[PDB]
Amino acid sequence: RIKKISIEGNIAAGKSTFVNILKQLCEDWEVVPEPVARWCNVQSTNGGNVLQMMYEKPERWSFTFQTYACLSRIRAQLASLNGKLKDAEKPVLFFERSVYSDRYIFASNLYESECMNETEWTIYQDWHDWMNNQFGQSLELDGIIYLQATPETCLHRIYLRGRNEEQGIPLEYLEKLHYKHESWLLHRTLKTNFDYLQEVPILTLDVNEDFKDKYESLVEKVKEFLSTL
Ligand SMILES: Nc1ncnc2c1ncn2[C@@H]1O[C@H](COP(=O)(O)OP(=O)(O)O)[C@@H](O)[C@H]1O
Ligand SMILES: Nc1nc(=O)n([C@H]2C[C@H](O)[C@@H](CO)O2)cc1F
Ligand SMILES: [Mg+2]
Numbered sequence: 001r002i003k004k005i006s007i008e009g010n011i012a013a014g015k016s017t018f019v020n021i022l023k024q025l026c027e028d029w030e031v032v033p034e035p036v037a038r039w040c041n042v043q044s045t046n047g048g049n050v051l052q053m054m055y056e057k058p059e060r061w062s063f064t065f066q067t068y069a070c071l072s073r074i075r076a077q078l079a080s081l082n083g084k085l086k087d088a089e090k091p092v093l094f095f096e097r098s099v100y101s102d103r104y105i106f107a108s109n110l111y112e113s114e115c116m117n118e119t120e121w122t123i124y125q126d127w128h129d130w131m132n133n134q135f136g137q138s139l140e141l142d143g144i145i146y147l148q149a150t151p152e153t154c155l156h157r158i159y160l161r162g163r164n165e166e167q168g169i170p171l172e173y174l175e176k177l178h179y180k181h182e183s184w185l186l187h188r189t190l191k192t193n194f195d196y197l198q199e200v201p202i203l204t205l206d207v208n209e210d211f212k213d214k215y216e217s218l219v220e221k222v223k224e225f226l227s228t229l
Contacts, residue, residue, distance in 0.1 A: 001086075001091075002081065002086055002091045002092070002093050003090075003091065003092045003093065003142045003143075003226070003229060004092075004093050004095065004139065004140065004141050004142050004143075005092060005093070005094050005095070005141065005142060005143045005144070005145060005226070005229075006094070006095040006096075006097065006098040006100075006101075006141050006143075006144050006145070007019065007094060007095065007096050007097070007144075007145045007147060008097060008098070008101055008144055008145070008146050008147065008181065008185060009146065009147035009148070009149065009181070009207075010149060010151065010154045010174060010177050010178055010181060011154060011158065011166060011169065011174065011177065012154045012155075012157035012158045012160075012161055012166070013147045013148070013149040013153075013154055013157070013207060014147055014149065014157065014207050014211065015034070015096050015097070015147060016033065016096070017211055018147060018207075018218075019031050019033060019094065019096055021215065021219070022094055022222075025219060025222075025223070026090070026092070027088070028088035028089060028090050028091050028092060029091075029092045029094065030080060030083075030085065030086075030091070030092070030093050030094065031093075031094045031096070032076050032077050032079075032080050032093065032094065032095050032096060033076075033096045034073065034096040034097050035072045035073065035076055036051070038072055039051040039065070039068070039069060039072070040052065040165060042068070045075075049165065050064065050065050050068060051065065051165045052164075052165045053065070055165060055166075055168065055169070058110060058113075058115040059114070059115050062107075062110040062115040062116050062120070063116050063120040063123070063124060066102065066106065066107040066110065066116075066124060067124060067127065069102060069106075070099055070102040070103070070107075070128065070131070071131070073097070073098075073099065073102065074099065074131060074135055074139070077095055077139055078135060078138065078139070080093060081093070081138060081139075092226060095139075095141075098139075098141065099128070099131070099132065099139065100192060100194065100197065102128075103124075103125070103128050103192075104180070104184060104190060104192055105177060105180045105181060105184070106177070107121075107124055107128075108180070109176055109177060109180060111124075113176075129193065132194070136194075140196065141197070141200055142200070142201075142229050143200060143201045143202070143203070143225065143226075143229050144185065144200055144201070144202045144203070145202075145203045145205065145222065145225070146181065146185040146186075146202055146203065146204045146205065147205055147207050148181075148186075148204055148205060148206050148207060148208075149206075149207050149208050150178070150208060151171055151174040151175045151177075151178045152171065153208050154174050154178075155169075155171050155174055185202055185204070186204065188202075201225070201228065201229060203221060203222070203225040205218055205221065
């Protein structure tokens with residue numbers, strides 16, 4: 001039916017930059033952006049900034065954040081499936097991140113860093129497993145595009161974007177997130193509770209260079225990659 005591709009990378013690697021060039025390349029391509037502005041002003045579907053709360057006190061707010069982060073993603077991705085506009089000779093749905101990074105990169109890292117205790121960690125995974133059982137098949141990936149950039153490039157791009165909440169993030173934290181992505185998507189040694197992911201095709205794009213100069217080659221590689229799926 002709808003081909004589903006998720007775009008993965010470190011904080012400020014360039015996912016929104018990349019996402020913003022995709023719709024102009026095929027009118028059959030849709031994008032589900034990550035709801036980060038919604039994490040900064042919590043309201044029902046002004047309020048709490050839950051991203052900021054986590055970063056200011058991660059031992060307190062990581063479980064709450066991670067749980068709300070993932071659910072709001074699921075809601076958003078589901079909304080665009082059943083979201084009418086599909087009917088196209090070749091529909092492709094791009095997800096900015098996935099329930100698998102949420103758990104295997106981000107939540108895992110905070111647990112491993114003592115920001116979630118055993119109880120919190122057990123509840124999260126239990127919730128995440130159940131959520132996948134219900135809405136898992138719907139959201140299964142046909143491919144991953146990994147936007148690879150050094151932690152140091154990312155640190156700099158955090159500065160460039162100037163999002164208030166992310167300005168205090170240390171290189172160390174970005175390095176941990178770097179190595180988890182490399183383990184999952186480069187070496188493919190990170191094991192998950194979802195077997196199909198081990199054979200899912202992966203496109204790796206080195207995005208350390210200037211977006212203007214790399215744009216044309218990246219477009220070629222994305223089209224080339226989609227045609228093999
Ligand atoms: N390849 C690139 N070359 C130059 N600047 C970039 C590149 N990719 C991203 N940026 C810049 O880096 C910052 C973060 O990019 P963004 O797309 O918001 O990252 P993400 O969406 O992955 O968090 C923004 O200032 C953006 O202008
Ligand atoms: N599961 C997640 N946990 C996080 O902590 N983030 C953070 C990273 C970045 O600072 C901001 C926007 O992605 O949210 C993003 C996730 F998807
Ligand atoms: Mg983004």
